[PDB]
RNA sequence: AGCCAGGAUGUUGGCUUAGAAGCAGCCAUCAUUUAAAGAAAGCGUAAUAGCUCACUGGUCGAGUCGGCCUGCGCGGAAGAU
């Protein structure tokens, strides 16, 4: 397949701990482990990692096809990182980072300050731009999408919290 | 006292959209909710306001320590604004003669008769934060009826001789007719303003642009609402030139054998036209 | 999500994936083109 | 010459100084002073009797620059400049009015031969016969 | 199937020209170059600038694609101690 024609090359600076089904990757700034399913046959062969679908679970081409895409992201996420910037377009809406906490100037009668978990070093260059930094590809989206779900992109003004690369489709009033 | 209310943005937005040259004076102290000081920059003094009272204090102090450098970089642009207003302050911006509070306004007041700079002030009307501050600039940056070019009655049709008349009481009388409201007591009313001269009570005030004779009744002043009968109208009051038989937009209110204005500029056009219809047939009679 | 018995691939870029078993059709810019039953 | 940034050939009769609203956007693409494209071409526009759409192309450059290529008017409007009316295509294969022979077509092709490297003489001859049949025009020599 | 990737360019494609300027719609429906391009599919839109389909022109470097017939499966499927 395309995934079978896709092996991943681990570089120096990220150590694997192959206890069979449980792999804990000792990396640069974290520990990106995934306890996969038993539809995989893993082997860090020489340097480039090779994998395999186990018999019986012949649908493990899917279940390890996740894994081939997975561990490639893990060895490049623990070292380099993800810049996940969000664009705050709100009338009187600010963003400021302190410790691991983000403020949410969100047009309410009360402030919303939610604490953010490990795997996050957040920053804020201004009141409308907010950095998020992380090692797992999941955690760099999950903490980002929760903020965006508190104020979705409003398609009559362009109001809302929105991603850096995301482009909304704002409409027009057309009646009054 | 609102979110998104950046003072330095808006005054420096005029230089982009309106294309003007504003140099502001009274700056901002406070993060818009704990806001307590308005930074007057000539005297370099912050003003305390009421805890929540409708108007107790006016307590002036120094520049606070949390804005000791933004007062530094903005005062040096204030004292620029007289070296390029008058040519005489050009050589003491660079020589280093002291630019006091009293010296700089003598140049900038003459920068209001040409109007290249406007004077800006941040504060709250409703939170009683700035209103007591805003009054002292009016006597020093807004012009007086005796400091301006006064009544200038030209002629009639003979020759274009524009004549600056006197702003004192030593002239023929002159006024103008505007804001001519109505009432179910006397009928027609006015909100007129006299520029110079004194009128007594009872006069043959004409309207010399449309050739009509009127007589000057019982003049009444207001608190914008309440009838207070102003008998003797001094030069500069605003009152109600009552009992005008016919009066148009902006004609003169002047005794004969005197200078005369004839001026109506920019007569508008009411555009949207809706047709009113009566309810009863007794209504169309009224 | 409008519901009707017919999922007809209507918009020009209409994805179809079987989430939970019930089909719901995924457009990009048109929210109006998204049905769910059938 | 250039690539995916910008390349559109649109200009109509150069007697009109103000950019016509539909032409506007091809000048409204990469930030021009519209007075510059009015002052570029008028030094040579006084060598013509105006009335035909003359074409130019636009092509762009990095900072605020731009460029343009001058050619001669096309033979498609030269077919309907001599024929009197500017629009004859009402029914292509049902109208038989109006003859011009090949000799007129090549002398409006030498001004193509002295201007451009494509639109060659003998190859365009059937398409200058092809713009005749769609308009409902006849040709004999 | 994606990243580079030109969207080779005669033309204004008429009519009726107010814009119906490939993108409102009826008749033509040729193509100057054909290793890549149609007098044309939508969005941007009064018109177009923006973004593509067109051939994937160069890279990956193997399989892949749209329908016909049947074995079964899912949705359709909401009722009253």
Swiss-Prot record, chain A:
One of its GO terms (biological process) is response to antibiotic. Keywords: Acetylation, Antibiotic resistance, Ribonucleoprotein, Ribosomal protein, RNA-binding, rRNA-binding. One of its GO terms (molecular function) is large ribosomal subunit rRNA binding. GO terms for cellular component: cytoplasm; cytosol; cytosolic large ribosomal subunit. The keyword Transferase does not apply. The modification N6-acetyllysine is found at residue 43. The keyword NAD does not apply. This protein binds directly to at least 2 domains of the 23S ribosomal RNA, thus is important in its secondary structure. It is located near the subunit interface in the base of the L7/L12 stalk, and near the tRNA binding site of the peptidyltransferase center. HAMAP family: Ribosomal_uL6_B. Belongs to the universal ribosomal protein uL6 family. Part of the 50S ribosomal subunit. This is Large ribosomal subunit protein uL6. It comes from Escherichia coli (strain K12). The lineage of its organism: Bacteria, Pseudomonadati, Pseudomonadota, Gammaproteobacteria, Enterobacterales.
UniProtKB/Swiss-Prot annotation, chain B:
It is found in: Cytoplasm. It comes from the Bacteria. Disulfide bonds: none annotated. Belongs to the TRAFAC class translation factor GTPase superfamily. Classic translation factor GTPase family. EF-G/EF-2 subfamily. Catalyzes the GTP-dependent ribosomal translocation step during translation elongation. During this step, the ribosome changes from the pre-translocational (PRE) to the post-translocational (POST) state as the newly formed A-site-bound peptidyl-tRNA and P-site-bound deacylated tRNA move to the P and E sites, respectively. Catalyzes the coordinated movement of the two tRNA molecules, the mRNA and conformational changes in the ribosome. This is Elongation factor G. The gene is fusA.
Curated annotation (Swiss-Prot), chain C:
This is Large ribosomal subunit protein bL36A. GO terms for molecular function: rRNA binding; structural constituent of ribosome. Signal peptide: none annotated. Keywords: Ribonucleoprotein, Ribosomal protein, RNA-binding, rRNA-binding. It comes from Escherichia coli (strain K12). One of the last ribosomal proteins to be assembled in the 50S subunit, it contacts a number of helices in the 23S rRNA, acting as molecular glue. The simultaneous presence of uL16 and bL36 probably triggers ObgE's GTPase activity and eventual dissociation from the mature 50S ribosomal subunit. The lineage of its organism: Bacteria, Pseudomonadati, Pseudomonadota, Gammaproteobacteria, Enterobacterales. PANTHER family: 50S RIBOSOMAL PROTEIN L36, CHLOROPLASTIC (PTHR42888), LARGE RIBOSOMAL SUBUNIT PROTEIN BL36C (PTHR42888:SF1). InterPro entries: Ribosomal_bL36 (IPR000473), Ribosomal_bL36_sp (IPR035977). Belongs to the bacterial ribosomal protein bL36 family. Part of the 50S ribosomal subunit.
From Swiss-Prot, chain D:
The modification N6-succinyllysine is found at residues 71, 80. It comes from Escherichia coli (strain K12). Gene3D superfamilies: Ribosomal protein L11, C-terminal domain (1.10.10.250), Ribosomal protein L11/L12, N-terminal domain (3.30.1550.10). This is Large ribosomal subunit protein uL11. Belongs to the universal ribosomal protein uL11 family. Forms part of the ribosomal stalk which helps the ribosome interact with GTP-bound translation factors. GO terms for biological process: cytoplasmic translation; ribosomal large subunit assembly; stringent response; translation; translational termination. InterPro entries: Ribosomal_uL11 (IPR000911), Ribosomal_uL11_bac-typ (IPR006519), Ribosomal_uL11_C (IPR020783), Ribosomal_uL11_C_sf (IPR036769), Ribosomal_uL11_CS (IPR020785), Ribosomal_uL11_N (IPR020784), Ribosomal_uL11_N_sf (IPR036796). NCBIfam families: L11_bact (TIGR01632). The modification N6,N6,N6-trimethyllysine is found at residues 3, 39. GO terms for cellular component: cytoplasm; cytosol; cytosolic large ribosomal subunit. It comes from the Bacteria. Part of the ribosomal stalk of the 50S ribosomal subunit. Interacts with L10 and the large rRNA to form the base of the stalk. L10 forms an elongated spine to which 2 L12 dimers bind in a sequential fashion forming a pentameric L10(L12)2(L12)2 complex. It holds the Pfam family Ribosomal_L11_N. The modification N,N,N-trimethylalanine is found at residue 1. One of its GO terms (molecular function) is rRNA binding.
């Amino acid at each position: 397949s395309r995934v079978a024609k896709a092996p991943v090359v681990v570089p120096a600076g990220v150590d694997v701990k192959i206890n069979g089904q449980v792999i804990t990757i000792k990396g640069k700034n974290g520990e990106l482990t995934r306890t996969l399913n038993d539809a995989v046959e893993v082997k860090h062969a020489d340097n480039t990692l090779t994998f395999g679908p186990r018999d019986g679970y012949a649908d493990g081409w899917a279940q390890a096809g996740t894994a081939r895409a997975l561990l490639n992201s893990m060895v490049i996420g623990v070292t380099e990182g993800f810049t996940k910037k969000l664009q705050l377009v709100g009338v009187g809406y600010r963003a400021a980072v302190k410790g691991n906490v983000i403020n949410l100037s969100l047009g309410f009668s009360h402030p919303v300050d939610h604490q953010l978990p490990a795997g996050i070093t957040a920053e804020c260059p201004t009141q409308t731009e907010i950095v998020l930094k992380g090692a797992d590809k999941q955690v760099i989206g999950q903490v980002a999408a929760d903020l965006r779900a508190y104020r979705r992109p409003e398609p009559y003004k362009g109001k809302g919290v929105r991603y850096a690369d995301e482009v909304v489709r704002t409409k027009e009033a057309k009646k009054k | 006292d609102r979110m998104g209310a950046n003072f330095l943005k808006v005054v420096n937005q005029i230089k982009t959209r309106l294309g003007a040259n504003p140099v502001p004076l009274q700056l901002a102290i406070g993060a818009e909710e704990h806001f307590t000081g308005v930074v007057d920059l000539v005297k370099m003094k912050a003003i305390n306001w009421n805890d929540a009272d409708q108007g107790v204090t006016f307590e002036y102090e120094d520049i606070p320590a949390d804005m000791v450098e933004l007062a530094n970089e903005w005062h040096q642009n204030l004292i620029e604004s007289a070296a390029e207003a008058s040519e005489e302050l050009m050589e003491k911006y660079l020589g280093g003669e002291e630019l006091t509070e009293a010296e700089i306004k003598g140049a900038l007041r003459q920068r209001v008769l040409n109007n290249e700079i406007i004077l800006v002030t941040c504060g709250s009307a409703f939170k009683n934060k700035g209103v007591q501050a805003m009054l002292d600039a009016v006597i020093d940056y807004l012009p007086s009826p005796v400091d301006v070019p006064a009544i200038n009655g030209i002629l009639d049709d003979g020759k274009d001789t524009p004549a600056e008349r006197h702003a004192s009481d030593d002239e023929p009388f002159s006024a103008l007719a505007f804001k001519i409201a109505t009432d179910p007591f006397v009928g027609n009313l006015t909100f007129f303003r006299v520029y110079s001269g004194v009128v007594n009570s009872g006069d043959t005030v004409l309207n010399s642009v449309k050739a009509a004779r009127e007589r000057f009744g019982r003049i009444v002043q207001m608190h914008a609402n309440k009838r207070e009968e102003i008998k003797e109208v001094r030069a500069g009051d605003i009152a109600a030139a009552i009992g005008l038989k016919d009066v148009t937009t902006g004609d003169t209110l002047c005794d004969p054998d005197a200078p005369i204005i004839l001026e109506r500029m920019e007569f508008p056009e009411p555009v949207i036209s809706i047709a009113v219809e009566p309810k009863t047939k007794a209504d169309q009679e009224k | 999500m409008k519901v009707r018995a017919s999922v007809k691939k209507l918009c020009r870029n209409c994805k179809i994936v079987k989430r939970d078993g019930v089909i719901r059709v995924i457009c990009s810019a048109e929210p109006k083109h998204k049905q769910r039953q059938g | 010459a250039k690539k995916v940034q910008a390349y559109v050939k649109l200009q109509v009769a150069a007697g009109m100084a103000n950019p016509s609203p539909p032409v506007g956007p091809a000048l409204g693409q990469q930030g021009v002073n519209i007075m510059e494209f009015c002052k570029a071409f008028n030094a040579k526009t006084d060598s013509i009797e105006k009335g035909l759409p003359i074409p130019v192309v636009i092509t762009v450059y990095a900072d605020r620059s731009f460029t343009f290529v001058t050619k001669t008017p096309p033979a498609a409007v030269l077919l309907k400049k001599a024929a009197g009316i500017k629009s004859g295509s009402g029914k292509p294969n049902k109208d038989k009015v109006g003859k011009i022979s090949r000799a007129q077509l090549q002398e409006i092709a030498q001004t193509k031969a002295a201007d451009m490297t494509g639109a060659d003489i003998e190859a365009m001859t059937r398409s200058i016969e092809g713009t005749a049949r769609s308009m409902g025009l006849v040709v004999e020599d």
